[PDB]
Amino acid sequence: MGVADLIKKFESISKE
Amino acid sequence: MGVADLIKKFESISKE
Amino acid sequence: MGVADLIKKFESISKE
Amino acid sequence: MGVADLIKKFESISKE
Amino acid sequence: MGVADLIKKFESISKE
Amino acid sequence: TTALVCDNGSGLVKAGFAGDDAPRAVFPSIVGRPRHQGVMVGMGQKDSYVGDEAQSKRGILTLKYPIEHGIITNWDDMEKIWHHTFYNELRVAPEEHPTLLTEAPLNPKANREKMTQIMFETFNVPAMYVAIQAVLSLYASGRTTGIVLDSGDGVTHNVPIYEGYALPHAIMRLDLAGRDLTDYLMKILTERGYSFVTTAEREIVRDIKEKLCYVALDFENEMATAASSSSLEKSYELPDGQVITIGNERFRCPETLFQPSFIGMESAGIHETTYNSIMKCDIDIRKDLYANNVMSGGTTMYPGIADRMQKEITALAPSTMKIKIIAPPERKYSVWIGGSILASLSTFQQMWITKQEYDEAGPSIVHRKCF
Amino acid sequence: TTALVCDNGSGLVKAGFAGDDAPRAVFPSIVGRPRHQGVMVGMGQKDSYVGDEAQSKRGILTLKYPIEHGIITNWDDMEKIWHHTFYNELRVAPEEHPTLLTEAPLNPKANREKMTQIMFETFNVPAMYVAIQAVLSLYASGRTTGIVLDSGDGVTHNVPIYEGYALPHAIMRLDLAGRDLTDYLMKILTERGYSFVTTAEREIVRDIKEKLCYVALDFENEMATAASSSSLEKSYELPDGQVITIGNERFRCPETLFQPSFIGMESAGIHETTYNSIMKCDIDIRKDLYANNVMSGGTTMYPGIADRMQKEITALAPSTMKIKIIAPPERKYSVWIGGSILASLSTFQQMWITKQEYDEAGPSIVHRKCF
Amino acid sequence: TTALVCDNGSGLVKAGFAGDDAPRAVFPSIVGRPRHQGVMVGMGQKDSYVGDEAQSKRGILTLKYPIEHGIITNWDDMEKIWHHTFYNELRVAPEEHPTLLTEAPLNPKANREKMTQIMFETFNVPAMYVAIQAVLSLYASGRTTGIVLDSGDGVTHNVPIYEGYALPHAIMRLDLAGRDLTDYLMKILTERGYSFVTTAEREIVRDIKEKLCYVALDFENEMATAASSSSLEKSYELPDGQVITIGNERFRCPETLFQPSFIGMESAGIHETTYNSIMKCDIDIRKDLYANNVMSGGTTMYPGIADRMQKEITALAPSTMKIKIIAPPERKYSVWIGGSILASLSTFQQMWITKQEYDEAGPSIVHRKCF
Amino acid sequence: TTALVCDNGSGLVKAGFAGDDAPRAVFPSIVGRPRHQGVMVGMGQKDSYVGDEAQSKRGILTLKYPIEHGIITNWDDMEKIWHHTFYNELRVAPEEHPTLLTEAPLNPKANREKMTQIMFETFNVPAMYVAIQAVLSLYASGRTTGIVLDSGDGVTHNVPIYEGYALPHAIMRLDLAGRDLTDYLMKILTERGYSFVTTAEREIVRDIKEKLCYVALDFENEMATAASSSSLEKSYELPDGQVITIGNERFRCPETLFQPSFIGMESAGIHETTYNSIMKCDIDIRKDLYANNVMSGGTTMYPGIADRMQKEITALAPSTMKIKIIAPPERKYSVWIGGSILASLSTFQQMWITKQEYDEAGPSIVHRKCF
Amino acid sequence: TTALVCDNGSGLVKAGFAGDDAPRAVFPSIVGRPRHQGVMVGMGQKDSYVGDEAQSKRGILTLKYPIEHGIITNWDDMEKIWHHTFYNELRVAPEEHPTLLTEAPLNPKANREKMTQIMFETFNVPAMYVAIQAVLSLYASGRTTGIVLDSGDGVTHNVPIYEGYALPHAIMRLDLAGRDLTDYLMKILTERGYSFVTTAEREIVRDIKEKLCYVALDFENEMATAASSSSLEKSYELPDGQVITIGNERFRCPETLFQPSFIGMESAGIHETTYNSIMKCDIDIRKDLYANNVMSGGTTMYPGIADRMQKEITALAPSTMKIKIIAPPERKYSVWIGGSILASLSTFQQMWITKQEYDEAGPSIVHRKCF
Amino acid sequence: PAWXAXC
Amino acid sequence: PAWXAXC
Amino acid sequence: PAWXAXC
Amino acid sequence: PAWXAXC
Amino acid sequence: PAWXAXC
Ligand SMILES: Nc1ncnc2c1ncn2[C@@H]1O[C@H](COP(=O)(O)OP(=O)(O)O)[C@@H](O)[C@H]1O
Ligand SMILES: Nc1ncnc2c1ncn2[C@@H]1O[C@H](COP(=O)(O)OP(=O)(O)O)[C@@H](O)[C@H]1O
Ligand SMILES: [Mg+2]
Ligand SMILES: [Mg+2]
Ligand SMILES: [Mg+2]
Ligand SMILES: [Mg+2]
Ligand SMILES: [Mg+2]
């Protein structure tokens, strides 16, 4: 879905 | 110790 | 070794 | 060797 | 296109 | 009129006559079939090959085992195994002799029932009995008390017996066996660049396992040693003359038995499994089971396995107790031997299912002493 | 200070910078050398050609790949590939950026160790990390669960992941890949009289494969159709203007993936291999793996491949279960993309091997998370 | 009712009857036509000449072969070859005997289909079968296992067989053959000023090749020797009494088989091709293939070829292995002989395509055992 | 209905009927006209004289030949020759018989076309064919292979034939012939004081040539001999009773054929010309041409010519080869004889140009088999 | 210190200095000698004449060429050619300049070795290099890719080059050249009654060829036209004022290049020869060779030759491809020009054989880049 | 030159 | 043929 | 002298 | 006739 | 994979 968005998804997962 | 001897041992045990 | 003999060899192999 | 014979030779060659 | 020019072309190719 | 004895295991078929010291037939439980187009029609090519015949031609066959984890899954192939065993390997008419067969404990009931049907209806055996290898292994050891750890190609199991009485609630079974160790070795050899994929290659890797592997008596020290030394490396010559050099795979393979996690199992290793079997027994019986830890089965042949087991059990068990491992060299044959003994005892001649009884009782009769 | 990302596969080299949506360098992993006498010395002729340069001159070069079945075999050629990637394709000084490289699972350890040595000693990279493509393919898919079937030019592999945890004992790998399908196609085209022999011709046949082949959703029906119809025939123009007409080779080539026996392998096809990987997983995880079958890699581009896979898996798997295949159009790039994501996560910045650490720890450090 | 056997090769046609030790017809596969104005009409001049007839008049004919690289390209000329074989060479009515024909492996399917159509529709053969020479060469060698390296005028090929089963994925084929060696020799003789251009001259050069060439067992030493010595020079008398003296061309010609680069091929030489065929086979089969390297075909007649092959294979293959070359003197006839054997086996009499079957099944029937 | 045969050569006209062994008309191709005032009007003096008639009156006629170097230059005189041949010499009506005429190879096409027009329009021949003497000379020799060296009064030519096929690119022609040898002799006799100038004297010198000249088998030895001996001198009686004594002119005249430089030609002599014709032929044909060197034509009548030719050819040709000269005594008639044979073969009766065909096709028809 | 460049061809000698646009010496490779008795001793008559000197006196000389079909056969005459070239034509001391010479590909090695010996030992050249004209023709065309069709007086040859690399296995050579076309024309003119025999006459016929002949773009239509029209006839004035009128010989002569059968060769014509050279090249290179068909050499000067070649190649080659012929007007000089370029490149100054090297290495050194 | 798109 | 004792 | 431009 | 055994 | 719902 695009790297900028995939990064946001994974950063959110890591923090959560 | 060999089957012939092991048989004798077990037959003796069963009878005793 | 000659066809007559090679035939005998192969017929024997097939049967065996 | 003579025309009669040379003819026979060539007719034979042509037919063969 | 003339030897003087063909030489320049090939010298340039060799160096490049 | 000597009974036939046949240990139709998942790896090898050990068969012969009761009252003797060795199987006469020791070929593998393998049925292979050509995986390539036949062209030389003139040679009388076969559709299938069996046992040693099959391994001798393995590079062109999809060799398969009919039995996996102790369960027969391919009955057509199993009848071929039996057929050859009776007529080509032992050269005996089944109709003339009663037959003693074996099976793993805690197997599906259907495995026993189907095997029985075949012996009575296809081979016309006049009588039949099915035994548990763990029991046969004590007859072969000359004793009525102890735990048999039978670890073969198919399954690994622990069955405590005390004064001939079994303690079935304490039976432990793992589906970790020599075939898995072999599969693990095929994978571990990848690390050094060797790649064994096909079933013929599986048999090659098995041969390697059998000659090079050993049990570390201290896994971490052997790893530290391997990491710093060539002294543990051994060469092996592959069938095509290619040399393969093997390092710490020599002990990382059998280590799986102590650490099943290496192949993804969460299950206890064999020393904890043995220990737990003892713990499930009445406290009064533990002393005798510890003093009679009996090993049998082909995978108990790794050098150092008995020594590792003693070291491990003594680390679980309380101190001030004798922990003894019995590991005679005939670990590969003790089951067959037990069969050879049992079938010869007069006390056992009432245990046979007579075909006449089977034909009236039906399959429920095979579960007498199901255990 | 953006990390460099470089998927040095066996077919193509995909390289660029972290945090972006595409590689900038997508040239082939090919190094070619002249196979003929040079005569026009005056033109400054080269000894070797790389990537697109090499393919553009392929008719005079013995084009070779440095990597075969995922393993680097020619390290001199591999350094040439890297050299060009860094300085001529990406135009970047390696010293200024950490680099993320990839490799197949279950490869030789030495492949990773040697690659690491080169990056630290020849290219002076300040830091390095090596990833498994199957993992990167899930990052690129936005999820932490599923099986990645990565099928490229080199190897085909299956790696199940659940909640980000890997299940390494369930990794399946086949050495059946696009390069073999290409070789098979070169052979199958023989039947219609076409003959492609040389390496330049191999690349031509590859191009053909890429444009004409498709996956039959019913192999026997497509064969029956081909045998009775011209409707499946397609033409292709060869570089010299010669037209080649291709019939059922269009689907008999990719069929190899379902029937490896076509090239002599006894191994399971990709649908059974995928299935078996699921079977090696705990029963509790199977439902989620079936619902997240993720395809990646260039050979997953055949039209009809996803549909064939669904049909095949649903014939092996039990009914009453959702079997789902995920096959986004960027199957050729999902690995690079995963690299682009991973290298950009703050969570990953502790995973890098700093050159300083390598220089004290030695090569064992490259196996952190070896998997 | 003896089957006819006919090896319609690209060089020579070997034909006769099954159950015997030699072909009766061994004339060349050549059809020639006048290339000059006929003037002596009175002699009954012909339009075309066949085989020995043609070579006997070669100086006035554009001699051509109907078969090139194992493929029939000129079917009108091929029917002439067959016509003469049946009626003028063997003096036999085709209707009275079934016929066994041969072909190269990996040829176009159409070649087999067209040949079949002709035998059934033009010669009315009651039955037909087509065999692969590599297979026939093992029947003729008395064995069911080995690799046949059949190297003739047309093509060179390697077909491994194990226990009569073929390994088709390991078939190697080169389109490097005696006709190319001959063409190369025509070119190499240029260096010493000799110039052979015409097709009649091609046949002269072929004769030279057959009498003077040999295989160097060490190419560089023979070159060094030639460069410093007259001891390797040989004379030959051309048909017009002109003497030609030939030097190192004697071994540089056959060297092409080991170094195909000499004629522009990038392909592997015959020793590497043989080796690769072995490598494509299961590891378990390699030992037997190495021990049964079978040579057949006319180009295997060069003195020293078997010795060179052993030396080369042993340099590729691992040590500690028996590498054996079988090269009986009848290398020119082993194919015909195999045909003579096969057609005579009772086991083979069900393999014939009966014309009746062809007429109902159509051409697909010719591919039974296509291989 | 026997065909007429007429060899209208430059020297003599040989004519008669097909199917016989000799021409009936053998008069010279000479038309003479008075060169002096007639005074005795009362005797019925003629304007022109033909053939033997003309030579019988040569001292008063400017005898001329209509044909020079094989080409007809004077067509009015040629019609006179034909007229007499048909009506006064052979006594036959041309309308009743087809006619076979001859010509040199490599002559002007117009010579054939004009001759044809005359036969069809002036003599009303029902059919016509024109042959090349070199071909006719082999029919007359009973063979289909060899080189005919036809050396007459007009031209000398070499035409190789193999198996009846001609090799036209190897035709050699010299315009050195008996008429030139005669002219040379007229000049050489000057040295001894004899002077022959007029055309009547030319015929006298021709007669001398025919009786006294011979071929030296070693020119230098004959010169050395002549220079030291009277043994080579011969006398001849001229028509007026005057005796002429001739020395080395006896062999210096025919020597011209071996050394054309004697008359100013740079051209090769006849032995080199013959040799070159062989060299222009395919190497495969040379052996048969050397073994069949066929001489025909009047100038091949010099004593010693065949022996000199063998000696010369064997000095040019490679050794170890049979070089054979065929020189039957009828060298003067072999052409006519060949005509007599050819015209009588049934195979030839389709070769005739029917007047009807000529009248529709025009002159191009005469070049069928132009050669 | 400018290198000398000298294209010692079989027809003309083109020589001068490197770095310039034209040879300064363009005289013919002819050495003539008197064929007649000298009488006016008082004029200082010569024994031999060279080049233009010889042609200016041709009517009294047996003009001969030292080189035939590209091979030097008369070395004494060749030294005379060189002597005059260096001292009388170019007026230069050989000792002061290195020299670049040329030769045909696929010539005898001895031709190169002997030429080298003479330059170093007779002319004391300080250095030497020998080039292949086909290569020089591309330097002169400004490119590194294409096929040069060099067709001169001596031989015709095709050498494909790609990116400066040669493809030697694809070299085609015909010994059909301008000298043969001239000989054929001498023969064909016979048909109209013209007869050219002597070597002086050969040169006259050559002049005729050069001015009147052209290439038919449709041979059959030109024949049909000639047969029905005077519009194709041209007159030519012979040196003695005699007018010769020539008809279809104008195009039947050069047609030989397309139909070598006209002179007895079975060989392919030049368009098929060119095509075959392309076919012997890797398929990947064909497109570029078709787009760069380069013509050079004197016989490529016939009007219509380039157009005929395009028409012919496009009839052999597959459609949908650009087939391009490059034919600059300096086809007679492109070889010399290439020499002028090559010898002037700095890159080439290491290619020279220094006399010092020759004197230690011996003749093998001349074959560096033998090709 | 005998195959169909390669020799 | 790329592995070490299997391909 | 009988040909047309040569004898 | 200039080669050595062919022209 | 040999049991019935577990291997
Ligand atoms: N030296 C050895 N070390 C370790 N394992 C071995 C050795 N020799 C044989 N084995 C293993 O023993 C197993 C065969 O088991 P066995 O008990 O004989 O029959 P089954 O397992 O069929 O009951 C195989 O997995 C085999 O590899
Ligand atoms: N349309 C297509 N259909 C099938 N396969 C394709 C197609 N396009 C490319 N391929 C294949 O993809 C492979 C390239 O794989 P890729 O995953 O991009 O790189 P790598 O294999 O190097 O990791 C080649 O074998 C190529 O032929
Ligand atoms: Mg067991
Ligand atoms: Mg990849
Ligand atoms: Mg053959
Ligand atoms: Mg005559
Ligand atoms: Mg030239």
Residue numbers in the entry:
A (entry chain C), B (entry chain A), C (entry chain L), D (entry chain G), E (entry chain E): 1 to 16
F (entry chain B), G (entry chain D), H (entry chain H), I (entry chain I), J (entry chain F): 5 to 375
K (entry chain Q), L (entry chain P), M (entry chain S), N (entry chain R), O (entry chain O): 1 to 7
What does the paper say about this structure?
The network of actin filaments in eukaryotic cells is involved in processes ranging from intracellular trafficking to cell movement, cell division, and shape control. The most commonly used one is Lifeact, which is a 17-amino acid peptide derived from the N-terminus of the yeast actin-binding protein ABP140. Phalloidin and jasplakinolide are cyclic peptides derived from the death cap mushroom Amanita phalloides and marine sponge Jaspis johnstoni, respectively. They bind specifically to filamentous actin (F-actin), and when fused to a fluorescent probe, their derivatives allow visualization of the cell cytoskeleton by fluorescence microscopy. In order to address this, we solved the structure of the Lifeact–F-actin complex using cryo-EM.
